[PDB]
Specification:
monomer; about 100 residues; alpha+beta; Erythroid Transcription Factor GATA-1, Chain A; two-stranded antiparallel sheet; 2 strands; about 10% strand; binds zinc ion; DNA-binding; Nuclear receptor subfamily 5 group A member 2
Length: about 100
DNA sequence: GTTCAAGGCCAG
DNA sequence: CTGGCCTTGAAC
């Protein structure tokens, strides 16, 4: 399937839904360090595989827009296991 | 024992 | 900063 954010190849469920590996890394990086970006355009830049790197601000807005969850990023940076969205993913897979 | 989604590593 | 690959571990 295609990443709902940039269209790249999905690698699995990441923070609420299927996304590509790069967007998973980007969202993690962003939320973990409270990164704050600023768009030089009009905060409505188009995101695609070849432009996602051009504006992190709009890339992040899209991540939130499509449904990526801030709560899936762990405050205590705990490793492994499975979060509260475990069952949800199991349901999304079936349907 | 196996899954597999979340965190970590690091070459570029 | 980016993103492909690695490590971790509760849930099943
Ligand atoms: Zn993506
Ligand atoms: Zn923008």
């Amino acid at each position: 399937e295609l990443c709902p954010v940039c269209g790249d190849k999905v690698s699995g469920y990441h923070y609420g839904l299927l996304t590509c590996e790069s967007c998973k890394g980007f969202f993690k990086r962003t939320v973990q360090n409270n990164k704050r970006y600023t768009c030089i355009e009009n905060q409505n830049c188009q995101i695609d595989k070849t432009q996602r790197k051009r504006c992190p601000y709009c890339r992040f807005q899209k991540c939130l827009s499509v449904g990526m969850k801030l709560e899936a990023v762990r405050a205590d940076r705990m490793r492994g296991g499975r979060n509260k969205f475990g069952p949800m993913y199991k349901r999304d897979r079936a349907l």
